[PDB]
Design a protein around this ligand. Structure first.
Ligand SMILES: *[C@H](C)[C@H]1/C(=C/c2[nH]c(/C=C3N=C(/C=C4\NC(=O)C(CC)=C4C)C(C)=C\3CCC(=O)O)c(CCC(=O)O)c2C)NC(=O)[C@@H]1C
Ligand SMILES: *[C@H](C)[C@H]1/C(=C/c2[nH]c(/C=C3N=C(/C=C4\NC(=O)C(CC)=C4C)C(C)=C\3CCC(=O)O)c(CCC(=O)O)c2C)NC(=O)[C@@H]1C
Ligand SMILES: *[C@H](C)[C@H]1/C(=C/c2[nH]c(/C=C3N=C(/C=C4\NC(=O)C(CC)=C4C)C(C)=C\3CCC(=O)O)c(CCC(=O)O)c2C)NC(=O)[C@@H]1C
Ligand SMILES: CCC1=C(C)/C(=C/C2=NC(=C\c3[nH]c(/C=C4\NC(=O)[C@H](C)[C@H]4CC)c(C)c3CCC(=O)O)/C(CCC(=O)O)=C2C)NC1=O
Ligand SMILES: CCC1=C(C)/C(=C/C2=NC(=C\c3[nH]c(/C=C4\NC(=O)[C@H](C)[C@H]4CC)c(C)c3CCC(=O)O)/C(CCC(=O)O)=C2C)NC1=O
Ligand SMILES: CCC1=C(C)/C(=C/C2=NC(=C\c3[nH]c(/C=C4\NC(=O)[C@H](C)[C@H]4CC)c(C)c3CCC(=O)O)/C(CCC(=O)O)=C2C)NC1=O
Ligand SMILES: [Cl-]
Ligand SMILES: [Cl-]
Ligand SMILES: [Cl-]
Ligand SMILES: [Cl-]
Ligand SMILES: [Cl-]
Ligand SMILES: [Cl-]
Ligand SMILES: [Cl-]
Ligand SMILES: [Cl-]
Ligand SMILES: [Cl-]
Ligand SMILES: [Cl-]
Ligand SMILES: [Cl-]
Ligand SMILES: [Cl-]
Ligand SMILES: [Cl-]
Ligand SMILES: [Cl-]
Ligand SMILES: [Cl-]
Ligand code: NA
Ligand code: NA
Ligand code: NA
Ligand code: NA
Ligand code: NA
Ligand code: NA
Ligand code: NA
Ligand code: NA
Ligand code: NA
Ligand code: NA
Ligand code: NA
Ligand code: NA
Ligand code: NA
Ligand code: NA
Ligand code: NA
Ligand code: NA
Ligand code: NA
Ligand code: NA
Ligand code: NA
Ligand code: NA
Ligand code: NA
Ligand code: NA
Ligand code: NA
Ligand code: NA
Ligand code: NA
Ligand code: NA
Ligand code: NA
Ligand code: NA
Ligand code: NA
Ligand code: NA
Ligand code: NA
Ligand code: NA
Ligand code: NA
Ligand code: NA
Ligand code: NA
Ligand code: NA
Ligand code: NA
Ligand code: NA
Ligand code: NA
Ligand code: NA
Ligand code: NA
Ligand code: NA
Ligand code: NA
Ligand code: NA
Ligand code: NA
Ligand code: NA
Ligand code: NA
Ligand code: NA
Lengths: 160, 158, 158, 160, 158, 160
């Protein structure tokens, strides 16, 4: 588990070098986006429920996926699905605040074969997380909304 | 890093960052510039910090004497190389906001290492401590942060 | 199903069905015909059961009013659709001998579902309850079984 | 874990339909075989020991399988083998009473690769379970003996 | 084997063989020659040991009588075959220094075996015991070791 | 877990034979090497630390392996590496005293795919264990040093 800062550090540790002007520059940049990240994390933390709502009704509800023969049709599979989206959003907020997507590859991704082996479709999941991207975006802004965009998309590329 | 630490602490409870932890991260990012300043000041004078080593030896001549772990100019040199390592770790920690990089890189299992090698741990503690006397001399009270960084090092060693 | 339930209860202890559990299963199979009769009677009058909905709304007009979860004819309709779902679950349960199909299909995590959706759970309980008043009106005391089925539904919901 | 009844139900749930005349018919049939199943389960439950006995002496004892170089030659491998047959019989009684073999695929089968990787032969196991089929059959009857037959055979097809 | 047993006991604690356990192993290796001698003496007279069986039957005629587990000359024979098995196990144990081979080969789950088979366990205990009376007659006090081996057998059986 | 003696036994159990003159011969041999094995195990037990020291400084220290970008470069990876060599030595002492290498195949080997999947190099590990072979040898002797040689080499063949 690293982030922008610790990523720069480790980039300056395996080579056995003190932090050079480049490290100081990248660290500078993250320090410049920090307040943004903090605020966005606060806002998402405050509205996680409503966001998962707008995502589910956005891409999922009132289709086959939710009807008999559907993957989120029963109430137990519905709770499992919204639970997955809650996880995805919370780790998207994590990675966002951090500045690097490794936490996703480490604690949520290492899942595609599982979904395949249990029938969980990936398409409606990609569309769902993307819906979370648009909802979160429109509710936080374009900058913070694109910064979540990169991580949401990252998860999409991980599942697909 | 303060950021990764609050992340892991929160995720451990399956919760979002609390407004208090968020505020802490805010104070960190606002301290970023002074932080980097201290880091580059230390990096600039690193050779001086590690050399002035001399204070350690003067205080612990046993390590460099016959029978000691750093007997000879080659072993002395290697011992200076370790001090360089730990100072670098201190600069990482300074930049990061906590002791994560220092722990991860050079405190998890150090006692095992030096026990195999036959290095007296208290000696290392004294070397990095002296490194904090010189270092503190290079900084004008800014000195606090790096101070507790070194201190966490020589404490965690033993 | 009573059959699957005693199976899992027995296997949990690595044992054969006890003669008592077997006798229970015997009473079940002997109740099979009356059971199916109740099931098809409910299925036949399902539209009536769910429509007469009306009693719920009359008792909980808040859910259909502005700000309520079922405001509008489309949301009202969807809410009627859920009542249909649960009635079907009741017929499954009747046929099966216990509440397994109802739990598995529409009680494991319902509170989560409706919490996301913003549906008041007590409202659902009242809808299925009314569904048990009408349903009970369709059956001549036979009414017991389906009775405790509905009751287990509106209890388990909250 | 389903059975005849719950199998019909689930057959009428993924389509979102109330139980039609067909469901009522199948349920009818199971209700017609119920008393038989109950009795047979009682009788097997009462004579499980003697059945595993007659099976082991039937297909296993006094051959290589039990002698040195054999898979049930030592006393620990003997106890493991008769334990396996006890399991198989008990789940055969389960599935029999239930009316559907999924419980086997769910709690005993998901075993062939294990036996292969630990040396347990499959042939003598098939012959053993079949021996349980003939013993149980002759001791319960032709109807209940064939109803156990379908599940014992199912396990044979699962191992082989 | 004493050797494998101290190995597993030590490894269980992630430690080297203690000097005491090592000394035990030394006494074992120094007893090797007398040990093998006893083993080959027993092996040589095995048929006599198992035949003189007769003492068991004379003491437990029920096992060979109608209704008994060893009724008939074929079942009697098989019962003699088991006694041969256990005597061989005794020779292994003698050579090895402990009861490991006996346990591993013919005591882990014996009660299960004979319970399925319908063999009275105390009968087996008496057979191997008699096997220790004859065997003890073949050895001149050397008799101790094999003694506690048999004894561990008829004890462990039940 | 077997050894020379128990290996001979099991060799005389799967065939259902009492121990013949051959078994008595092999057992004889082990009984002849026993005191040697015991002593060597004592000496190694007494000097395990110094042996792992001389091995590490022998093949590992003052190269890339220990420097940044190295597999034992950090202090946590250093402790893990010397811990591995300690294990290897202790099981080499085990197998040595026992007289058969199965314990290695059973409790340390069943590791190559793990090292590959976590980046642990095999070359420096082979050279390290071999260094333990030369150190242990020169410190115990040629006979006990070759008897450890066979097991150390065994581990080398297991990793490679
Ligand atoms: C100096 C204050 C003390 C001292 C030190 C000493 N160290 C060594 C040898 C090594 N030290 C390390 C240390 C690290 N590796 C790491 O990854 C980290 C964290 C970043 C640290 C701190 C290592 C790997 C070695 C061995 C090989 C190598 O350095 O490349 C020696 C050498 C002893 C010998 O006989 O070889 C000495 C003498 N000596 C003292 O007396 C002081 C108390
Ligand atoms: C009616 C008494 C109450 C009420 C209900 C209401 N429900 C919804 C939306 C959904 N309800 C479900 C329910 C189920 N799915 C299942 O698999 C099962 C078990 C078989 C059940 C009970 C689902 C999946 C949805 C959403 C999508 C879909 O139905 O296809 C709504 C819609 C709310 C909205 O804004 O969309 C309403 C209004 N409303 C009340 O006020 C009553 C208390
Ligand atoms: C004799 C003292 C008692 C007795 C014995 C008896 N045994 C059997 C049948 C078997 N016994 C075994 C025993 C072993 N198998 C092992 O691997 C080991 C450890 C090395 C032992 C001790 C086995 C496998 C069988 C069955 C098949 C076979 O032997 O090949 C019988 C047969 C009973 C029957 O009806 O078949 C008997 C009678 N009987 C007594 O009454 C004595 C107390
Ligand atoms: C953060 C780390 C992490 C994640 C992300 C995770 C996902 C995960 N999703 C699962 C199942 C599931 N996942 C879904 C998801 C969906 N269904 C839909 O229709 C939607 C389109 C979609 C969600 C958007 C469903 C229905 C199941 C249940 C399948 C079943 O067991 O019945 C399961 C199996 C366990 C269980 O829930 O019963 C795991 C382990 N697990 C983890 O440890
Ligand atoms: C119900 C769910 C279920 C089943 C059925 C099951 C089977 C099973 N059989 C096993 C071993 C075994 N199985 C046998 C079976 C046989 N040997 C013979 O010669 C006979 C022909 C045959 C039996 C008819 C033997 C000898 C072993 C032991 C192999 C060993 O570990 O030494 C093992 C390994 C664990 C152990 O017993 O030590 C499993 C896990 N496990 C389960 O969880
Ligand atoms: C006895 C049974 C047994 C053995 C032998 C064993 C080995 C083993 N070595 C490991 C890692 C490792 N092994 C090494 C070893 C080396 N690095 C070097 O440069 C050297 C050349 C070399 C040793 C000579 C290192 C650095 C790691 C840590 C990799 C990591 O997780 O970061 C790990 C992963 C767990 C961990 O340590 O964090 C196992 C499980 N495990 C067992 O259960
Ligand atoms: Cl630099
Ligand atoms: Cl689930
Ligand atoms: Cl989960
Ligand atoms: Cl965590
Ligand atoms: Cl800490
Ligand atoms: Cl169960
Ligand atoms: Cl229940
Ligand atoms: Cl219908
Ligand atoms: Cl086993
Ligand atoms: Cl098991
Ligand atoms: Cl162990
Ligand atoms: Cl013991
Ligand atoms: Cl022979
Ligand atoms: Cl580690
Ligand atoms: Cl480990
Ligand atoms: Na790292
Ligand atoms: Na370096
Ligand atoms: Na540069
Ligand atoms: Na850089
Ligand atoms: Na650079
Ligand atoms: Na900012
Ligand atoms: Na906010
Ligand atoms: Na729609
Ligand atoms: Na960024
Ligand atoms: Na899984
Ligand atoms: Na695909
Ligand atoms: Na959770
Ligand atoms: Na807090
Ligand atoms: Na100086
Ligand atoms: Na010097
Ligand atoms: Na010290
Ligand atoms: Na069991
Ligand atoms: Na009971
Ligand atoms: Na009406
Ligand atoms: Na309305
Ligand atoms: Na409510
Ligand atoms: Na199902
Ligand atoms: Na439907
Ligand atoms: Na139809
Ligand atoms: Na049908
Ligand atoms: Na149909
Ligand atoms: Na019947
Ligand atoms: Na009966
Ligand atoms: Na035969
Ligand atoms: Na049937
Ligand atoms: Na397995
Ligand atoms: Na095959
Ligand atoms: Na350990
Ligand atoms: Na001791
Ligand atoms: Na005689
Ligand atoms: Na006789
Ligand atoms: Na007895
Ligand atoms: Na063996
Ligand atoms: Na034999
Ligand atoms: Na011969
Ligand atoms: Na031989
Ligand atoms: Na031979
Ligand atoms: Na010797
Ligand atoms: Na010694
Ligand atoms: Na060198
Ligand atoms: Na040897
Ligand atoms: Na692993
Ligand atoms: Na390779």
């Amino acid at each position: 588990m690293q982030d922008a800062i610790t990523s720069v550090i480790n980039a300056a540790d395996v080579q056995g070098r003190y932090l050079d002007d480049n490290s100081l520059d990248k660290l500078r940049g993250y320090f410049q986006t920090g307040e943004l990240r903090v605020r966005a994390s606060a806002t998402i933390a405050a509205n996680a429920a409503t966001i998962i709502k707008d995502s589910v009704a956005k891409a999922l509800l009132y289709s086959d996926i939710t009807r008999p023969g559907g993957n989120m049709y029963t109430t137990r599979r519905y709770a499992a699905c919204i639970r997955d989206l809650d996880y995805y959003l919370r780790y998207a907020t994590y990675g966002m605040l951090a500045g690097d997507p490794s936490i996703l590859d480490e604690r949520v991704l290492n899942l595609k074969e599982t979904y395949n082996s249990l029938g969980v479709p990936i398409g409606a999941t990609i569309q769902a997380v993307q819906a979370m991207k648009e909802v979160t975006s429109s509710l936080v802004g374009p900058d913070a909304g694109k910064e979540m965009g990169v991580y949401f998309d990252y998860i999409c590329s991980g599942l697909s | 890093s303060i950021i990764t630490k609050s992340i892991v602490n929160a995720d451990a409870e399956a919760r979002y960052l609390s407004p208090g932890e968020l505020d802490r991260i805010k104070s960190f990012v606002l301290s970023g510039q002074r932080r980097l300043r201290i880091a580059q000041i230390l990096t600039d004078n690193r050779e001086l910090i590690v050399k002035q080593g001399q204070q350690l030896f003067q205080k612990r001549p046993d390590v460099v004497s016959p029978g000691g772990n750093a007997y000879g100019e080659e072993m002395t040199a290697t011992c200076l190389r370790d001090l360089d390592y730990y100072l670098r770790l201190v600069t990482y920690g300074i930049v990061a906001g906590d002791v994560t990089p220092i722990e991860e890189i050079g405190l998890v299992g150090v006692k095992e290492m030096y026990n195999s090698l036959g290095t007296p741990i208290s000696g290392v503690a004294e070397g990095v401590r002296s490194m904090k006397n010189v270092a503190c001399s290079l900084l004008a009270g800014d000195s606090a942060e790096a101070g507790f960084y070194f201190d966490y090092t020589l404490g965690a060693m033993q």
